[PDB]
Amino acid sequence: GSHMTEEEVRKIMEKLKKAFKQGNPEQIVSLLSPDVKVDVGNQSFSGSEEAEKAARKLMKFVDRVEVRDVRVFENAVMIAVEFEVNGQRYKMIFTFYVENGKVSMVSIYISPTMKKLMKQI
């Protein structure tokens, strides 16, 4: 009545996984709920518009994307990625929490070395 079956979460996982693998950010943005909450480093973003703006900014600095692993846990889709920015490689973890077929919350873990870089972006 308000939750998502494993099958439903898996469908969104496949979409997210495919989008990351193709380096296709627009598919992921379309999966965000209008009031999506994004947490990355000290920064926090509210709303799909703010999230889309942030995603586009980040992707402009990213020269290469590699998907290391993807896992589903309850209504959470976790994606471990490596981004190349200016010849340097950074590992990040994206967690997508799904409600009603869309992503309500995004938690992004970034390494301390990327924190300095991420402030610029």
Q: Which CB sits closer to its own copies, 88 or 113?
A: 113
DSSP string, 16-77: HHHHHHHT-HHHHHHTEEEEEEEEETTEEEESHHHHHHHHHHHHHHEEEEEEEEEEEETTEE
> By CB under 5 A, is residue 104 in contact with Na ion?
yes
User: Applying CB under 8 A, does 107 fall inside the site for its own copies?
Assistant: yes
Would you count residue 20 as binding its own copies (CB under 8 A)?
Answer: no
* Number of residues that make up the chain: 121
Residue with tokens 């509210």: 46
How far is 105 from 120, CA to CA, in rounded Å? 23
| CA distance linking residue 82 with residue 93, whole number of Å | 9
- Least CB distance from residue 22 to Na ion, whole Å? 26
21 scored as a contact of its own copies (CB under 8 A):
no
Q: Is 5 in the site for its own copies (CB under 8 A)?
A: no
- Contacts (CB under 8 A) with its own copies, residues 83-102: 91, 93, 95, 97, 99
Chain residues binding its own copies by CB under 8 A are 2, 37, 39, 42, 44, 69, 71, 73-76, 78, 80, 91, 93, 95, 97, 99, 105, 107, 109, 111-113
